[PDB]
Design an enzyme around this catalytic site. Structure first.
Site, PDB file in Angstrom:
ATOM      1  N   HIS A  41       0.813  -1.211   0.000  1.00 21.69           N
ATOM      2  CA  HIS A  41       0.000   0.000   0.000  1.00 21.69           C
ATOM      3  C   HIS A  41       0.849   1.266   0.000  1.00 21.69           C
ATOM      4  O   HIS A  41       0.289   2.366  -0.019  1.00 21.69           O
ATOM      5  CB  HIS A  41      -0.967  -0.001   1.187  1.00 21.69           C
ATOM      6  N   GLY A 143       4.503   6.552   9.921  1.00 24.38           N
ATOM      7  CA  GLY A 143       5.825   6.146   9.502  1.00 24.38           C
ATOM      8  C   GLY A 143       6.324   4.870  10.134  1.00 24.38           C
ATOM      9  O   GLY A 143       7.522   4.576  10.042  1.00 24.38           O
ATOM     10  N   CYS A 145       4.683   1.738   9.586  1.00 21.73           N
ATOM     11  CA  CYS A 145       4.497   0.665   8.622  1.00 21.73           C
ATOM     12  C   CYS A 145       5.848   0.197   8.097  1.00 21.73           C
ATOM     13  O   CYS A 145       6.725   1.006   7.783  1.00 21.73           O
ATOM     14  CB  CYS A 145       3.609   1.153   7.476  1.00 21.73           C
TER      15      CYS A 145
END
Ligand SMILES: *C(=N)N(Cc1ccc(Cl)cc1)N(C)C(=O)[C@H](Cc1ccccc1)NC(=O)[C@@H](NC(=O)c1cccs1)C(C)(C)C
Ligand SMILES: *C(=N)N(Cc1ccc(Cl)cc1)N(C)C(=O)[C@H](Cc1ccccc1)NC(=O)[C@@H](NC(=O)c1cccs1)C(C)(C)C
EC number: 3.4.19.12
Lengths: 301, 301
Positions: A41, A143, A145
């Site tokens: 994603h 930030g 992920c």
């Protein structure tokens, strides 16, 4: 001598964390050999997330839309493919720090260490449990992920978690390192929710043993019980049914302490019914279930 | 997005941990430059500990009674001196991994990460607080002496704790890296005990702010209070007196949330009087005080 929730030393993974950027989005990636794994994603804009066709979105992608940094160094992207829900981005430089590593899909109730990072920089390390509903209760801000969970078993680094999602209820979710989500979740901005969380009974027992080992023993009783009878009180309080294999697994702990599993199940039975009456167990006023039997035996022996 | 007790990434210290042995005793040491720091009671036998004269005990020592291993490698000991309560053992090989480092003496109420080791091998990492009575509540089994606490501030590694002792009450104690004990303790097997532990008020407030940030806000009230009035309820429950500087320190947190320090002190006032009535704050049924304001701002911002 003390019992603390602790995480594996994180050096062997600190050196595999890089920064990934695509469009206006930046998050984390995992640099092993000549490949950087990250959540797919990353290629999605605000509008895409609603209903993304990732194959289509990825074709429109050229390597120059993907920017990767090992610290301040930059890495050259020379290819990009999708594997389930993870972006594989091949690069020229093989990481000279790549450790001996596996990609493991853990079991609910099992624990792993998470190295939380923000823009490719490691921030800190902590232990999480894979809940029976395939969520985890961690610390993943913007930030985060791409932060990965892992275990260290003697030689090897077993990667088991990459963080993708946060749920309306404050809990977290991600994939193994092959890109398969734990739980029913999808990387799409649509309605989805966890199942009912039950409580990991075998871990709670392991935690009581850990507490007996460290001097907390007020909760010990003279009663004993049978599995079926305890497991009837278990079911009442959303506790995982206990099984004979769980009892086998608790063997070494019951041995070190001299308390039959079934004697502790009766102590646990009393604590679900009557609560703690203001005493504490290893500095909690609640029962804890994110310690495996292994995690305890490791620290108490 | 979650709030977890987490420790600094430990890579920069993992590589400084070696194994030290003297006689029938083995514990841990810290290899920085050409020096290995470890606790001086390593040179003591069972009988010595009762009343050791370390200067005398150390003279009888020759370098060959000291055996040091970086992993399986062995290091040559070419000198040995005492600095307060730490053994300095010079060696031929400067550690090629030595990081940029300081030796800091932290303040009570401050927090550091501890890298627990057993026979020079790192085991895991966790966060501890220096209690107001100069103890810590960690996880130090046999062979854990020499494990060190540290903070990472941007560039630097600040070493602040080396573990020496365990107390009759289950808590722990050690020295800075110059060898000065925190608290009144001595490396001698004689009667000594901690002072009364009070509770770190400013940290508890920081923890409530952290909890408001993460959605727990049932404990918020409309009342407000004055420092002197709150600090009268503080003194009742062995809580550190709050000060105006603590309020200044909590500034940024009170800002991020919109709650005056003094409005939260009233919320805290109510929780000491009436308890929690079976609700939880960030997954505890007890108030927590081993988070500094900095530790929270770091994770929530
Ligand atoms: C990771 N770097 N990252 C940023 C981030 C956003 C919000 C918070 Cl609180 C912390 C970090 N994350 C978590 C994301 O980018 C993901 C991407 C994503 C994945 C699946 C579906 C949608 C978006 N953002 C989210 O997890 C979002 N979650 C959802 O929209 C849904 C959850 C269940 C169904 S939809 C938000 C809500 C956290 C933004
Ligand atoms: C460190 N490697 N190490 C071994 C160890 C022993 C017991 C436990 Cl539970 C965990 C680890 N330690 C802690 C020690 O070797 C120290 C050395 C020492 C320091 C000062 C005084 C005596 C001994 N052992 C202890 O801490 C012991 N403590 C005491 O005897 C006293 C504490 C207060 C007054 S005397 C014991 C009791 C832990 C053995």
């Amino acid at each position: 001598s003390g019992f603390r929730k602790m995480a594996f030393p994180s050096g062997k993974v600190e050196g595999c964390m890089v920064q990934v950027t695509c469009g206006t989005t930046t998050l984390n990636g995992l640099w092993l050999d000549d490949v950087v794994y990250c959540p797919r994603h990353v290629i999605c804009t605000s509008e895409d997330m609603l209903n993304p066709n990732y194959e289509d979105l990825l074709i429109r992608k050229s390597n120059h839309n993907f920017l990767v940094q090992a610290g301040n160094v930059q890495l050259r992207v020379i290819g990009h493919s999708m594997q389930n829900c993870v972006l594989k981005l091949k690069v020229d430089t093989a990481n000279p720090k790549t450790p001996k590593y596996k990609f493991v899909r853990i079991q609910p109730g099992q624990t792993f260490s998470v190295l939380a990072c923000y823009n490719g920089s490691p921030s800190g390390v902590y232990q999480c449990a894979m809940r029976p509903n395939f969520t985890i209760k961690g610390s993943f801000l913007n930030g985060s992920c791409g932060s990965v969970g892992f275990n260290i078993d003697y030689d090897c680094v077993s990667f088991c978690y990459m963080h993708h999602m946060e749920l309306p209820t404050g809990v977290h979710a991600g994939t193994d390192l092959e890109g398969n989500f734990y739980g029913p979740f999808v990387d799409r901005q649509t309605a989805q929710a966890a199942g009912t969380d039950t409580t990991i009974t075998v871990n709670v027992l392991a935690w009581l043993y850990a507490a007996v080992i460290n001097g907390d023993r007020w909760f010990l009783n003279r009663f004993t019980t049978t599995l079926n009878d305890f497991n009837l009180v278990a079911m009442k309080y959303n506790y995982e049914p206990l099984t004979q294999d769980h009892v086998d697994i608790l063997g070494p702990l019951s041995a070190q302490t001299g308390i039959a599993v079934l004697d502790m199940c009766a102590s646990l039975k009393e604590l679900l019914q009557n609560g703690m009456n203001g005493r504490t167990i290893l500095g909690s006023a609640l029962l804890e279930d994110e310690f495996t039997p292994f995690d305890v035996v490791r620290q108490c022996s």
